[PDB]
Design a protein around this nucleic acid. Structure first.
Ligand code: MG
Ligand code: MG
Ligand code: MG
Ligand code: MG
Ligand code: MG
Ligand code: MG
Ligand code: MG
Ligand code: MG
Ligand code: MG
Ligand code: MG
Ligand code: MG
Ligand code: MG
Ligand code: MG
Ligand code: MG
Ligand code: MG
Ligand code: MG
Ligand code: MG
Lengths: 134, 171, 258, 184
RNA sequence: AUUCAUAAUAACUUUUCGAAUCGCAUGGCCUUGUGCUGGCGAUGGUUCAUUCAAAUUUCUGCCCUAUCAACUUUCGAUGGUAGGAUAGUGGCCUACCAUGGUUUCAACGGGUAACGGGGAAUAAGGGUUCGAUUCCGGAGAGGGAGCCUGAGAAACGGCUACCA
RNA sequence: UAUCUGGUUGAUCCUGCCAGUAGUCAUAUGCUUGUCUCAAAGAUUAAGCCAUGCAUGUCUAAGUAUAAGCAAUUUAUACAGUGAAACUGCGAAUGGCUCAUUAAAUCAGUUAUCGUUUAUUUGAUAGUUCCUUUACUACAUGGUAUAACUGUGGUAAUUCUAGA
């Protein structure tokens, strides 16, 4: 690009979650769409820790472009980053994968159906099979 | 017929309706304190029945193929310590830790017996807890007796100073 | 009716929490605790909005379950645990201790205090009675019960608490001239060097209160918190020192530094 | 559920719809200042009424009343910052009769025309709405900005816009496109 | 301000509570016995205080109508005594007693296209009209009644009955 | 932002009333419709009636697991990894919806409980109980049923249940 000049503002240390909180102020003249995925490494070698210990979110472009403001988090190590960052933000970075699950409508069906059954239901399963024969 | 069960020895060989509650057969509550009205059949046997449940109290002379010839084992052995004791009835120090009934199950080529557990079995962990609570009762009482004593002497000195103060007054 | 309520809608929380009216239907309802509902910090407000340590409500929860935040020497890992006037919010990590003190405008302000004197708290005694077996006791403004107190301790006094044991270290009698704190009322958040009180037998004892700048004002007895003798206090006052500086000279003061 | 969103109206229609003494005066204000509606004048007069209402309520109060001085100073300063009020008239009695077009002439509509580079108010209205303006460092396309006497020297063409460089222009780009292919 | 807190005596109880519960760490002492001591907690538990509450309650305030002027007390209407009941005060209910209580300063009755407020519209000033409805309080789960469980419901995505 | 104007006469002095005029978090409707932000929405008539599908369930290191469940043991021949089901403990009295009833009733501001209950938080708070209490006695911890489970069934049908 040209004059990316990533800047961090209002930096406050958060040792409660072993993290540094700061506002990612981006100046990108003649550029747009600063591609927060690329904000991770440029914020990594600034703090020198690693690329997978930094998370970026927010980044609403100002009126007319050429400037962006968002929020950034950098962790001491990836161990606490995986244990603190939300699961939704991790899958964006590729750290975790989508957990396969039926739609919210379908889960409600299964819970309601399973309420009609008392016990495991194996005894009922053979009983209806025995009854269905005759 | 229609599958309505009998209420034990109630009356009325016909069908009736009753307000069934907890600790009563023919009904299983789905809520705490709930009661419900369900049709039940009488105790007296009539031609309207589809199934009659029977049990044998004294065997005859001929062998029934499916009832007397066969034999099935009880599903589970005792779990509590004294339940195992009375099952064998040897003594009060039998150390049933190695007397647990075990069930061998072959998940694969490996075999294991998974003896379940013993409830109410004496353990040094249980003895330690009893010691802690027993000592805690004494330890608290020791602090209470001295606390009232310290306040007693604090109050006594306060009264003595007031008595001395009024002694100086009135010449 | 039909039972105790378990929700607190927004626009119904106390105004000193400074919760924005938008961005959410509900506000954190304080749990039952040592302080009343309206006069409550609770930690999710304090750890997220005051100190900005946490952004969401989920990571407010994560902080407490690591036993980081402890209140009055006890961990108190409750998301909406009610924290009240001068409850020592201490954090073992980051080696910082906070005391809850009203600022000039009556809101709760962050007051960092040194570890040496963050090991005690002052409590305004509410009632003094006799317990079972003839054991006298006192109840502070945060519900603590302390047995075998000094006989000279009477109602409306303030008592220093050891904050490590239930025993007391010192107390101040409620007399004229003592340094007092305004907790509640219109003048909430002021320190006022008590001068005189009117008995008003039957109800609502009143008291006259004079500021260091000779600005006198009146508040009910229930709203005054004696915090020491005139001059040296027993606690570290926050910025402003409870002066109720007027709006006309507030713009003048803020214009000096810009 | 959530708290209601507060909204307010910012204009008021005159009581008499068809009166020639006002009908032509309205077209006068919209004439040389490039306004598309009477609501622009209607809008301006609304807080002109609100300013006078606040000022009238101040003069009723006694002199040296803290409330008279406090919001008196705030009102007198806030209009001076906008510039609709001259520095000499800082007595709270000249704010009552300021003018009806004093507010209007402080708009970005006029300022672009005042400070050259527009050569007509009707050209300027296009220029603001065409997104070639930087009142500060920021692009603005709202003709009613009410410049604050702290940014009048700061109006300039936006860096990411023609007439300010960094691009030739959109339609000019395809204009030379035929020129290049025709020469071949 | 108390017959208050609290304490003392004689008793009473079909007898409440006063830990037969769970996880982790495993440490010291000797007459080395599965010996004696021993931490961090979790859950539970009588009473007191606190908090979240609830119930009852003081004073003042509500739209239109006299083509509503007297009402209430048969069998509660007002008060007293005593008792039952309630978690409690209290005609809340019962027995007896007295004949009271409200009313032109608008009772009682009737209507409301009436849930009440915070508020909304328009207003020089005084006002007029509206507020089912984002907050507070109340009521209801088709209409009534009754009740289990539970701290808390006369609960209705709890139950029973009648009516539709 | 303290403003009026037209309409009874041949022409007139004049509360008339009618009409015009402006606003509406006052609705409905007609015609028309490019953009950004923001946003009410089956209240009014019928608190009329409803197919269907959802809207209350819940566990840690720390109550109970022989799943005749899943993997690895090698820390263990009793158990201690994960864990369906069920017993147990809490919750389901919150929230949400509507305004039918209701006119000293609710409600508002303001009082009292020396006239009461209060699960849950928080601080305190049981050395006293082997009962003819010198053999009655296990106090290194005592008794029973039962769910889940196995097996045998009833019905067209229900979150129906019986017997062993
Ligand atoms: Mg809460
Ligand atoms: Mg009585
Ligand atoms: Mg009586
Ligand atoms: Mg109605
Ligand atoms: Mg409501
Ligand atoms: Mg109800
Ligand atoms: Mg209906
Ligand atoms: Mg009901
Ligand atoms: Mg329903
Ligand atoms: Mg007028
Ligand atoms: Mg005439
Ligand atoms: Mg004529
Ligand atoms: Mg007239
Ligand atoms: Mg009209
Ligand atoms: Mg509700
Ligand atoms: Mg209605
Ligand atoms: Mg407690």
């Amino acid at each position: 690009s040209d004059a990316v000049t990533i800047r961090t503002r209002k930096v406050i240390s958060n040792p409660l979650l072993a993290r540094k909180q700061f506002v990612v102020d981006v100046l990108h003249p003649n550029r747009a769409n600063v591609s927060k995925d690329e904000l991770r490494e440029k914020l990594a070698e600034v703090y020198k820790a690693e690329k997978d210990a930094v998370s970026v979110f927010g980044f609403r472009t100002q009126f007319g472009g050429g400037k962006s403001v968002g929020f950034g988090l950098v962790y001491n190590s990836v161990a606490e980053a995986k244990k603190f960052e939300p699961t939704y933000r991790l899958v964006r970075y590729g750290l975790a994968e989508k957990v396969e699950k039926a739609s919210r409508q379908q889960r409600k069906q299964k819970k309601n159906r399973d309420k009609k059954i008392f016990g495991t239901g194996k005894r009922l399963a053979k009983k209806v099979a025995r009854r269905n024969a005759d | 017929k229609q599958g309505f069960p009998m209420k034990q020895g109630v009356l009325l060989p016909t069908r009736i309706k009753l307000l069934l509650t907890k600790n009563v057969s023919c009904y299983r509550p789905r809520r705490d304190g709930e009661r419900k009205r369900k049709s039940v059949r009488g105790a007296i046997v009539g031609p309207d029945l589809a199934v009659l449940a029977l049990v044998i109290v004294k065997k005859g002379e001929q062998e029934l193929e499916g009832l007397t010839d066969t034999t099935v084992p009880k599903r589970l052995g005792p779990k509590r310590a004294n339940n195992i004791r009375k099952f064998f009835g040897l003594s009060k120090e039998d150390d049933v830790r190695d007397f647990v009934i075990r069930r061998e199950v072959t998940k694969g080529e490996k075999t294991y017996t998974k003896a379940p557990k013993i409830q109410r079995l004496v353990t040094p962990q249980r003895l330690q807890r009893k010691r802690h609570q027993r000592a805690l009762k004494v330890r608290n009482a020791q602090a209470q007796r001295e606390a009232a004593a310290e306040y007693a002497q604090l109050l006594a000195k306060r009264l003595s100073e007031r008595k001395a103060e009024k002694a100086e007054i009135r010449k | 009716a039909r039972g105790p309520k378990k929700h607190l809608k927004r626009l119904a929380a106390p105004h000193h929490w400074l919760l924005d009216k938008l961005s959410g239907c509900y506000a954190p309802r304080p749990s039952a605790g040592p302080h009343k509902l309206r006069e409550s910090l609770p930690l999710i407000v304090f750890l997220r909005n005051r100190l900005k340590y946490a952004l969401n409500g989920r990571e407010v929860k994560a902080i407490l379950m690591q036993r980081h935040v402890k209140v009055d020497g006890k961990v108190r890992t409750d998301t909406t645990y009610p924290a009240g006037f001068m409850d020592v919010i201490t954090l073992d990590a980051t080696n910082e201790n906070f005391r809850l003190v009203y600022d000039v405008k009556g809101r709760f302000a962050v007051h960092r205090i040194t570890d040496e004197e963050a090991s005690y708290k002052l409590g305004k005694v509410k009632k003094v009675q006799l317990g079972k077996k003839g054991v006298p006791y006192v109840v502070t403004h945060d519900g603590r019960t302390i047995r075998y107190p000094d006989p000279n301790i009477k109602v409306n006094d303030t008592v220093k608490i050891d904050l490590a044991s239930g025993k007391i270290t010192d107390f101040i009698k409620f007399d004229a001239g003592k340094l007092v704190y305004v907790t509640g009322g219109r003048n909430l958040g002021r320190i006022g060097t008590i001068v005189h009180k009117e008995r008003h037998d039957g109800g609502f004892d009143l008291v006259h209160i004079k500021d260091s700048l000779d600005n006198t004002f009146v508040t009910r007895l229930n709203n005054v918190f004696v915090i020491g003798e005139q001059g040296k206090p027993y606690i570290s006052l926050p910025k402003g020192k409870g002066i109720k500086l007027s709006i006309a000279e507030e713009r003048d003061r803020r214009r000096a530094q810009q | 559920p959530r708290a209601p969103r507060t909204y307010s109206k910012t204009y008021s229609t005159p009581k008499r719809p068809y009166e020639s003494s006002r009908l032509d005066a309205e077209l006068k204000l919209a004439g040389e200042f490039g306004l598309k509606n009477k609501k622009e004048i209607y809008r301006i007069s609304f807080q002109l009424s609100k300013i006078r209402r606040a000022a009238r309520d101040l003069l009723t109060r006694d002199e040296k009343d803290p409330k008279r001085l406090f919001e008196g100073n705030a009102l007198i300063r806030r209009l001076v910052r906008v510039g609709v009020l001259s520095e000499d008239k800082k007595k709270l009695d000249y704010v009552l009769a300021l003018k009806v077009e004093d507010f209007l002439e402080r708009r970005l509509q006029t300022q672009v025309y005042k400070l050259g580079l527009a050569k007509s108010v009707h050209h300027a209205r296009v220029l603001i709405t065409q997104r070639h303006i930087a009142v500060g460092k920021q692009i603005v396309n709202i003709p009613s900005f009410m410049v604050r006497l702290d940014s009048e020297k700061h109006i300039d063409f936006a860096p990411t816009s023609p007439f300010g460089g960094a691009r030739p222009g959109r339609v000019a780009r395809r204009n030379a496109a035929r020129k290049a292919e025709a020469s071949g």
